[PDB]
Task: inverse folding
């Protein structure tokens, strides 16, 4: 019986998974009983693995055997499957399983039950699993494709989680609401919210990644290209290494666009990467066209790969591109010259007249993308007299930032040092 | 070691698979002569498929029959060895069979036979010989995966016990692969370490090896190391006496004769486009050597006029201006042009300024790592 | 660790300057010497 | 066997003369160095560039 042997091995793995769930529940109970209003993060670190390894028979047997404390809410799980914290964690697992099964109707009903239960039970150590539940509520309503009541619900939950001085829930709710705004392109709303809200300075590195990505997107569409570029570079540095391929691809795409807008040329290592070559190929063509400075190749690339540009969302950025494409030309010219004349700039950029070249370069000076001077008495753009930048306060300022950062890290480490008895 | 396959075969095939050189008929005569001599019916079929050639059935049938008879008799001898002789001769039978498969051009069959022979054999020297045959097949067919796997296998065997001769042959193979994959620094190291004791005549004659060493050394070595190990190299000068153009190239660079240097670099570009191992490196190599020449000229100047640069390099002023602008924009030269009054200022960074910038870069990297670790652990 | 599933998903260190399309350096230098 | 050695001797003598003549200076005209050394401006400049490199 090959099928019976496979089922036997699967059920052995199932018993192992039940043992893992038992260990996680024990960790939760240690968290609630003992001090250190923590260790739920340990319980939840393996949450992706548990969700991946969950099975219909496993969850059915689990719902039959567990929830023995009290209450008959097991009837909200058993028909769909054929304590303070344990119910929340097990129910989070169950709703994740309904997600994996794609049964969004019961998924959303049970999720609303989760939200009513969390509102009823105002607990702090529970608030972490509450934040994960909020994340999965946003995910289920996204799959349902409503994301309308999501705004108000997560927004009130954010109000609760900021009135209670939380960090994890604050970050999660803020990220979810920013994504809700972006989904419908409510960029003004998201900008106002970000301006008037303070992202918790101690939140999960992944929440930092998401928040930095969204803030960079807001800034890019708001025409703060340097701010968006630095923010998304920080986001990319924060994002995980051997995972989150989709998040990395999105960040790379929009950061490539934003850097081209700044007038720079993205690194070729991006496009060469094994995980990003196929996805970024349209942007590789775009970068090639802009660097070559040819409007014809730029336009043909745009026409060929408009579809992916709808899917990602860059068109406003991809025309601000053309703008910063002529800007890229002038920036390269100013990067490899010191006293070039206006006629020479015009000829090199294929502009129409030295008058037009003069306008372009003067505006580039204004925007500070070449950071030079100009002189139309003799019709030549002078560059700033480069100064020996070590007998000045820039090294002091850089070393001051780095010294303060190192001092802060040492203080954080020596504070986090704990002695458990 | 034996020529199996003669990499000259791959050289001819690649050189033939190029525009403006197809059907010169000298390359075709040479390749057909070799193919007929070694009875490469399968490789002939592959070449016909690749280049869309008029297949000569009359001679193709003869080659097929010769190869089939050879294979059958080798297999019969192998079976006889199994039935009567012991492992010591069964190994030789399999080994000869695999050699013949390589000679004809049966790639996959040859690899399978060599894997079987490697599994059977226990002698360390014969294991090395098998690994070297696999490496030569890998070089011939430019299968980077097989080449690297067998390079690691050879290194592991040498660590598990080897000898100087196989060490040098493996060094030449590693250098050839590095030249193939554009690792000119390691290629220079290996080639210069094995220049005085070149034994691998199956890959290329000593003159070709010395030309490769000169090219790779010029593109990879600084001026002091170049003078110590190439310009003052006994065994390189001895061959450069026979090679008058490679010598002119190398010494035009060394003695700061730049017009002659660009002439020699153009001829090198043509030669090394025609070449099969360097073929996907001629644009990059020419670009890097031009950058090296420009940096070398500007290394002893604080303000060099474009007229003087153009006269020194034997080119126009627009040419030098365009090249300098391109390389400065790419960040490969420490110089800023000034076109209203044509002058090339030299903005090389002071020692302390360079040290400060390096400290900033390395500290930024290390601080990012420290931040990531601290945020991973504090929670 | 965490996975951002909420977002759907030449051995060489090649360089940008390698992609440029221009005549062979031999041709460029030949034309330069020819006109000068 | 003698031409190469005399060429080396000449180059070393030129280097020594350039060092000697340039010692009492901080910013010199190549024309003046050539006048002091009794050579041509181009040759002295090429030797100076080689020495600097």
Result:
């Amino acid at each position: 019986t090959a099928a019976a042997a496979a089922e036997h091995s699967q059920r052995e793995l199932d018993t192992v998974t039940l043992e893992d769930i038992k260990e996680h529940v024990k960790q939760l109970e240690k968290a609630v009983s003992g001090k250190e209003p923590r260790f739920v993060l340990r319980a939840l670190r393996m949450l992706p693995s548990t969700s991946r390894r969950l099975n219909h028979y496993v969850l059915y047997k689990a719902v039959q055997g567990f929830f023995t404390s009290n209450n008959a809410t097991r009837d909200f799980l058993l028909p769909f499957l054929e304590l303070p914290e344990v119910e929340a964690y097990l129910q989070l697992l169950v709703v994740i399983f309904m997600m994996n099964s794609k049964r969004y109707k019961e998924a959303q009903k049970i999720s609303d039950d989760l939200m009513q239960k969390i509102s009823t039970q105002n607990r702090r150590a529970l608030d972490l699993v509450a934040a994960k539940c909020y994340y999965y509520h946003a995910r289920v309503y996204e799959f349902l494709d409503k994301l309308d009541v999501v705004r108000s619900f997560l927004h009130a939950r954010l109000r609760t989680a900021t009135l209670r001085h939380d960090a994890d829930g604050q970050a999660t709710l803020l990220n979810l609401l920013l994504r809700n705004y972006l989904h419908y392109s409510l960029y003004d709303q998201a900008e106002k919210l970000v301006s008037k809200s303070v992202f918790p300075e101690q939140a999960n590195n992944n929440e930092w990644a998401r928040y930095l990505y969204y803030t960079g997107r807001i800034k890019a569409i708001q025409l703060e290209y340097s701010e968006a570029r630095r923010t998304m570079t920080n986001a990319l540095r924060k994002a995980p290494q051997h995972t989150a391929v989709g998040f990395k691809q999105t960040v790379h795409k929009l950061l490539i666009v934003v850097e081209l807008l700044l007038g720079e040329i993205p690194d070729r290592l991006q496009f060469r990467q094994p995980s990003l070559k196929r996805s970024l190929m349209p942007y590789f063509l775009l970068t090639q066209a802009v660097r070559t400075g040819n409007l014809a190749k730029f336009n043909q690339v745009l026409d060929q790969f408009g579809e992916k540009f709808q899917a990602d969302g860059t068109y406003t950025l991809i025309i601000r591109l053309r703008h910063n494409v002529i800007k890229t030309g002038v920036r390269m010219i100013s990067l490899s010259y010191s006293r070039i004349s206006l006629a020479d700039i015009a000829q090199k950029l294929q502009l129409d007249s030295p008058e037009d070249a003069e306008f372009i370069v003067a505006k580039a000076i204004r925007d500070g993308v070449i950071e030079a001077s100009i002189n139309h008495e003799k019709g030549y753009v002078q560059s700033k007299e480069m100064i020996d930048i070590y007998s000045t306060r820039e090294p002091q300022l850089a070393f001051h930032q780095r010294i303060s950062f190192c001092l802060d890290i040492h203080n954080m480490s020596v504070k986090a040092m704990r002695f458990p008895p | 070691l034996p020529k199996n396959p003669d990499l000259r075969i791959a050289q001819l095939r690649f050189l033939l698979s190029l525009p403006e050189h197809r059907g010169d008929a000298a390359v075709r005569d040479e390749l057909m002569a070799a193919v007929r001599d070694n009875n490469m019916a399968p490789y002939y079929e592959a070449l016909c498929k690749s280049l869309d050639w008029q297949i000569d059935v009359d001679l193709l049938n003869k080659m097929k029959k010769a190869n089939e008879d050879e294979l059958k008799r080798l297999d019969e001898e192998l079976e006889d060895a199994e039935k009567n002789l012991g492992e010591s001769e069964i190994r030789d039978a399999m080994m000869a069979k695999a050699e013949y498969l390589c000679r004809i051009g049966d790639k996959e069959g040859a690899l399978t036979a060599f894997r079987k022979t490697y599994d059977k054999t226990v002698a360390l020297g014969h294991r090395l010989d098998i690994v070297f045959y696999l490496l030569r097949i890998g070089l011939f067919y430019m299968d980077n995966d097989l080449i690297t796997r067998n390079t690691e296998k050879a290194k592991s065997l040498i660590e598990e016990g080897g000898d100087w001769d196989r060490r040098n042959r493996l060094k030449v193979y590693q250098g050839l692969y590095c030249v193939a994959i554009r690792d000119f620094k390691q290629a220079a190291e290996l080639f210069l370490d094995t220049v005085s004791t070149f034994t691998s005549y199956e890959l290329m004659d000593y003159k070709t090896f010395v030309t490769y060493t000169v090219y790779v050394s010029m593109i990879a070595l600084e001026r002091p190391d170049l003078r110590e190990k190439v310009i003052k190299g006994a065994e390189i000068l001895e061959v450069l006496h026979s090679l008058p153009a490679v010598r002119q190239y190398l010494f035009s660079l060394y003695e700061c004769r730049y017009s002659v240097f660009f002439q020699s670099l153009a001829v090198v570009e043509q030669e090394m486009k025609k070449d099969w191992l360097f073929a996907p490196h001629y644009r990059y190599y020419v670009r890097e050597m031009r950058i090296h020449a420009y940096s070398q000229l500007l290394e002893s100047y604080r303000s060099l006029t474009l007229g003087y640069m153009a006269e020194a390099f034997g080119v126009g002023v627009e040419f030098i201006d365009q090249e300098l602008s391109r390389f400065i924009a790419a960040g490969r030269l420490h110089c800023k042009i000034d076109k209203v009054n044509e002058i090339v200022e030299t903005n090389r960074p002071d020692s302390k300024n360079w040290q400060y910038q390096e400290t900033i870069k390395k500290g930024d990297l290390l601080l990012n790592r420290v931040q990531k670790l601290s945020r991973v652990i504090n929670m | 660790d965490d996975e951002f599933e909420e977002f759907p998903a030449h051995v060489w260190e090649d360089n940008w300057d390698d992609d440029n399309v221009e005549d062979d350096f031999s041709n460029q230098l030949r034309a330069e010497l020819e006109k000068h | 066997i003698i031409s190469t050695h005399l060429a080396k001797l000449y180059d070393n003598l030129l280097e020594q003369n350039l060092i000697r003549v340039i010692e009492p200076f901080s910013r010199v005209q190549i024309e003046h160095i050539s006048s002091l050394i009794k050579l041509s401006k181009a040759d002295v400049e090429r030797k100076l560039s080689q020495m600097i490199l």
User: Anything to note?
Assistant: Residues 1-36 of chain C form one domain. DSSP finds one helix and no strands in chain C. Chain C has one domain: 1-36. Chains C and D do not touch (no CB pair under 8 Å).
